[PDB]
Amino acid sequence: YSGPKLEDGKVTISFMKELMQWYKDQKKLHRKCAYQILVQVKEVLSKLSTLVETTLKETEKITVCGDTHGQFYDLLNIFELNGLPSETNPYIFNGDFVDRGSFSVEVILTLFGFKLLYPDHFHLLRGNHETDNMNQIYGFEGEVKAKYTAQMYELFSEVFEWLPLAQCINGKVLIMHGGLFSEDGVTLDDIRKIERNRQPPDSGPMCDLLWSDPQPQNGRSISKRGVSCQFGPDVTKAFLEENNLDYIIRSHEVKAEGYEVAHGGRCVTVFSAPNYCDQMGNKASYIHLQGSDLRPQFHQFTAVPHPNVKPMAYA
Numbered sequence: 001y002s003g004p005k006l007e008d009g010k011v012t013i014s015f016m017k018e019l020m021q022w023y024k025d026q027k028k029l030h031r032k033c034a035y036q037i038l039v040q041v042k043e044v045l046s047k048l049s050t051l052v053e054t055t056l057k058e059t060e061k062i063t064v065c066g067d068t069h070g071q072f073y074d075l076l077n078i079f080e081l082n083g084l085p086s087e088t089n090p091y092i093f094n095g096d097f098v099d100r101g102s103f104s105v106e107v108i109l110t111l112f113g114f115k116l117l118y119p120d121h122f123h124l125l126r127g128n129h130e131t132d133n134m135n136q137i138y139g140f141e142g143e144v145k146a147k148y149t150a151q152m153y154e155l156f157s158e159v160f161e162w163l164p165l166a167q168c169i170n171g172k173v174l175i176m177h178g179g180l181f182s183e184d185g186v187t188l189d190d191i192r193k194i195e196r197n198r199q200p201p202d203s204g205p206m207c208d209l210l211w212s213d214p215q216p217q218n219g220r221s222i223s224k225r226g227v228s229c230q231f232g233p234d235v236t237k238a239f240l241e242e243n244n245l246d247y248i249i250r251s252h253e254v255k256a257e258g259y260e261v262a263h264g265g266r267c268v269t270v271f272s273a274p275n276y277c278d279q280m281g282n283k284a285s286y287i288h289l290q291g292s293d294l295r296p297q298f299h300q301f302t303a304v305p306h307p308n309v310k311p312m313a314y315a
């Protein structure tokens with residue numbers, strides 16, 4: 001093995017560039033480097049609040065991406081389009097890094113590696129697919145067992161349970177993967193107290209944050225997903241009012257243009273997996289915010305070439 005090696009047991013910026021090239025060429029990170037990343041990233045993530053609270057000063061910016069779904073070569077395209085993560089080019093990836101696409105291992109190890117290199121500026125939130133249920137069925141477990149072992153997979157599963165569930169920028173924008181809640185009256189403080197290091201339950205706030213979807217009409221509906229609900233603009237507006245927030249950003253649904261802004265501006269969807277599963281034909285986007293003006297700016301982009309491995313080949 002002549003592949004990327006950690007320097008003094010730790011991730012550095014040449015290690016990350018070597019890993020990206022290595023993975024682009026479709027090679028495997030040695031199992032012990034992988035293990036060292038996973039156990040160090042568990043340690044980092046387990047000190048985080050369930051709600052990450054970040055301050056963006058006026059000349060600072062942050063990029064928000066939504067679901068990426070094992071589409072590694074499109075992840076590389078985002079970094080070419082937008083620049084590598086760094087203390088001055090912060091990122092939040094809003095859940096759903098794995099499943100569906102067949103380069104989930106490459107995506108998750110690159111994002112974990114960057115979380116290690118810039119822990120105050122590179123942010124990962126849980127989505128509905130960072131879960132054992134989902135991974136068993138949709139590709140990730142099959143992929144970790146083909147490339148590594150059942151054991152390495154259990155370690156992934158445990159790391160995911162410590163990924164924070166939401167992030168609030170400047171007490172004004174809150175970002176979560178799914179959306180808002182199936183009961184009124186939830187506060188940021190309640191979110192901060194969810195004990196997140198578990199598989200999600202069937203109902204309740206932790207389930208809503210990973211699973212819920214906005215609807216255009218006022219009220220709440222039973223979800224067609226079979227879990228959580230659909231929340232209308234009256235839901236968003238009461239939630240934003242009680243918590244003193246401006247709007248939320250979520251992901252969790254494919255959009256033709258890569259973004260949508262529902263609820264009169266209050267509920268934004270960002271989706272970062274272009275030509276999702278090699279089929280949907282959609283565009284993707286990411287959002288920039290800056291401290292002096294937190295309104296979202298969307299940047300769209302389309303799929304790039306990748307190796308001939310079919311989506312879900314590992315399911």
Ligand SMILES: O=C(O)[C@@H]1[C@H](C(=O)O)[C@H]2CC[C@@H]1O2
Nearest residue numbers: 067096128129251252253254
């Ligand atoms: O992100 C998607 O395209 C889908 C839905 C989502 O919940 O985010 C979910 C189920 C399969 C995919 O992940």
Ligand SMILES: [Zn+2]
Nearest residue numbers: 096127128252
């Ligand atoms: Zn989702």
Ligand SMILES: [Zn+2]
Nearest residue numbers: 067096129252
């Ligand atoms: Zn998804």
